[PDB]
Design a protein around this nucleic acid. Sequence first.
DNA 1: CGCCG
Lengths: 131, 129, 131, 129
Amino acid sequence: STTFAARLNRLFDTVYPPGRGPHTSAEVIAALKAEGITMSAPYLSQLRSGNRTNPSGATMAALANFFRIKAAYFTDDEYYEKLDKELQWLCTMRDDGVRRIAQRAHGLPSAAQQKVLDRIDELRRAEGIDA
Amino acid sequence: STTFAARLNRLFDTVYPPGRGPHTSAEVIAALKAEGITMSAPYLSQLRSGNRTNPSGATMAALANFFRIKAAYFTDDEYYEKLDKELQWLCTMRDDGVRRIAQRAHGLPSAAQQKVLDRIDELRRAEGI
Amino acid sequence: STTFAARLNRLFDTVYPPGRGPHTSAEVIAALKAEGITMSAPYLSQLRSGNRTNPSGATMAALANFFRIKAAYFTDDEYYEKLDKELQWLCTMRDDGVRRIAQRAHGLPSAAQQKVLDRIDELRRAEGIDA
Amino acid sequence: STTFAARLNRLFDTVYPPGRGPHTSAEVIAALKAEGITMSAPYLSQLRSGNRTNPSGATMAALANFFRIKAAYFTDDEYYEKLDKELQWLCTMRDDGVRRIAQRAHGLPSAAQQKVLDRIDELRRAEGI
DNA sequence: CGCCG
């Protein structure tokens, strides 16, 4: 349902290691070389940008194992979903607002955490977000 | 400071990819082998056990680059704590009481978020904390 | 680990409907036509017979969809594993010897069946089949 | 003899692909839509319920080409039974009393198998039967 | 043929 090259961009944009930015396009062709796999740079920019789709079977597996997730992510439409909630969670785990909030709601009791997370839903409701 | 032995297991148990659990000791060795570098599972496992210390400037590199972090993690005591925060977060959060709410907090304009911070303090205060 | 074209031939050879023989090559390009998908017949024959490998993402999706199994079979090695035991199985429920055996051993009690299984294992032992 | 709506559920329940359970009624009409043919889940479910009978000549064929069986399955009352055998067959097996037993028998030379077919009787004789 | 530039 979601195009390949978008499935792909999601990856660079979300998966990447602690204490640094996300993976550049070339970090990947280089790391892919050092593991003994040729890939064009412009075939990567092409795939990534939408300019070409329907890549090789292995061309997917090559990238899937660079970010260290199964190649099914691209092929299997099920596992995609099962794993999509996830990247949404990383991207959430980085946003600084959510952070400052949770750090303070930590040390907070069970009933009391509720009243908090309800206030959140009234502001969501009242933002035209949850309406 | 902290035994490198423990600084390694930090990584092992905090940094892993999405959609799965922590990295097995052998995943590592085999991955190294893939890159063309070579190390022994007995050595590695020995390092984490703590029956070997002071590792090669080269093996430290071969680890820090498979974990895609800086090697100064193991050597520098500053970048270490400064990047240990970054993990310290990654953990405290995957807790549950907070998972639910942190999820619903995302996307509130940073104006509205404020009102939630103030809200929280109300309760903080109400429990004497 | 197992090549693609053999993953495929396994499909042709095992999976097919009751009362009839297996799916021929053309049956598939035709049923593929009427579902509104072009594919070259010699591109099939090539793929099947190893003449060409590393097919498109979608080229796999189509054939997997024809036999009604998940396309992840071709890509993800794990699931393929998990699903192979299965085809091996139906290759079993067609062997006629196994049938005429099972339809006899049906109706026997709990430890009589066991005493049977053991005999099977001693003939297997004694065939140079089991070690 | 036997009904139609029941001959249909026969198929639904016995005939499916590997690695999963039986087909949903919707999977069907949607698959048909794919082929380019049209049918209403209310009609289908209605046919299976038994609130409709005497299906169109070409709804019967729209169904039997989806299950990839012969449409004569629905009409002919002999070949129904003949190709029912092949069904009542797939089933008696999946029951795992015999699953285990049946796996080990494959590959035994058609000679050795015989020796198993006879042991079976020693036992059968001892019970009954 | 079609995937890889």
